[PDB]
């Protein structure tokens, strides 16, 4: 629980980031046609927050994998020059920068 505090900090910094707006909650299939058809494993920051809050991450590596899944999904579905596409690249580098401050 307490040993993952730094992942909690990274998640908060991600949630508070200017480019985080597409990723705060799960993508709504009634708003994005066929999204979950194309993306088998959706992921978002609120889902990660709830998993951290219940102690559902057995390692920091599992948390990092969910973070990358947010950005891999975004790059799979969104054009690179779209608003969400741009935000995903910005956020991926932000996450990578924070991760390499510990690893
Ligand atoms: C463009 C739709 C989209 C949003 C989006 C657009 S507007 C918004 C804010 C909702 C309220 N916080 N999210 N996000 C993601 C990851 C999307 C896709 C297709 O991948």
Numbering used by the authors: 1796 to 1898
Provide passages from the article that reported this PDB entry.
However, as observed in compound 36, Glu1820 oscillates between two conformers, one in contact with the compound amino group and the other exposed to the solvent; this interaction seems to contribute only partially to the binding affinity. The thiazole nitrogen forms a hydrogen bond with water W4, which tetrahedrally interacts with the main chain of Pro1817 and water molecules W5 and W6, in turn in contact with BAZ2A. Water W5 is tetrahedrally coordinated by the terminal amino group of 44, the Trp1816 main-chain oxygen, the Leu1819 main-chain nitrogen, and W4. Notably, in the structures in complex with 44, 45, and 47, an ethylene glycol molecule is sandwiched between the thiazole ring and the ZA loop. It forms a hydrogen bond with the main-chain nitrogen of Asn1823, an important anchoring point already explored by the BAZ-ICR and GSK2801 chemical probes and other BAZ2A inhibitors, and a relevant indication for further optimization of this chemical class.
BAZ2A is an epigenetic regulator affecting transcription of ribosomal RNA.
